[PDB]
Design a protein around this nucleic acid. Sequence first.
DNA 1: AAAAAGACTAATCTGTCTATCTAT
DNA 2: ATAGATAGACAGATTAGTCTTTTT
Lengths: 176, 177
Amino acid sequence: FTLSDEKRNHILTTALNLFDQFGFQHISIMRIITEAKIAKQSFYMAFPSKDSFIIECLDMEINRLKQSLSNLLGQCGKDDHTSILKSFYQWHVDLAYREGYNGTLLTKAVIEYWNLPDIKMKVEDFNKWKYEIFAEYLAEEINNARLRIIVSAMNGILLPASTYLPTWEDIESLYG
Amino acid sequence: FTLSDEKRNHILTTALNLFDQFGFQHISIMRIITEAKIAKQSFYMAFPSKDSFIIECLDMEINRLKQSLSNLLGQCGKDDHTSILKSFYQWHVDLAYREGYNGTLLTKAVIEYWNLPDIKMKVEDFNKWKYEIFAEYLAEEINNARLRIIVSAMNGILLPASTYLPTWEDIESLYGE
DNA sequence: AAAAAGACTAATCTGTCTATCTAT
DNA sequence: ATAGATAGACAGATTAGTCTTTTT
């Protein structure tokens, strides 16, 4: 009748792991219901439809990636512009350089869910946020021409089935 | 027990136009058959299953992307490395600016079919082919640290819901160094 | 015989939604 | 009565193998 946030946040986390491992298509409600040690009726007292459940899962993953990159950049010196560059590269690395990587969860949401314009907007607002939060740290050094190439090159790393990825020493030569 | 190859390409091209705008899991084979104005049994005589049809659809797209890039870089002036880099850049922007872009058809096949290992191999074979055919025309080594950044910046243009696309003058200033 | 159109079916699998059934 | 499990059940679609009729 009123799903507890202990249980409510369990269908979200269980589905997010099932979605990142596989896909939005393969993983069904019945798959998440059993693995989250929950029933089917109580799942609908907090989420009306599956499309609302996918949007809810996307906002949680976007906020997760937001805090993940926010803390990683704040651990370097304000004048150490090279440490911010390496943290930005290693952040895109530990995502793509993982076992069973088939793209980020945000890229999957834009491919399967072109029907809802709010989903592509939610991902676009984060990609713009990732660029602007990275330029906030390095605004007095790297110019906008090189910044757009740095971020676009880092986005090419997140692209699955990509070859000839730019190493850190390759990124080191761009700064100087 | 055999099918006309003219009809074979009609089922293949109809599904490709359906997948590039809607993805693989949205379009069913009953929709592909009804959209191609063909019969349901003629689809199974040529293609044994649905995954065999998808892999055949991926091989046709890669060979299409191969000739499209081989020609665009080939029609450029000989030893005009700047004009080739400009055509290589405008090629990725032309793909990302196509209406209804939710990702490359290769990216969808990789994401939506993680189970089939040969799908991830064919796209990896294409991206490996794309980087090496670019170093050939530029008279540059296959290990140029600049080249690895240029191509990866172009793939970032093909990212779904991308933003802050680098301008041509940005890619020009890199190669100018 | 060859190909090509036409539904059958069947075995399957979901999306919600009903109908209780408790323990609390 | 709240909360949460535990089921089938309506309603669609669905992929693959069957059967019929037909034109070349």
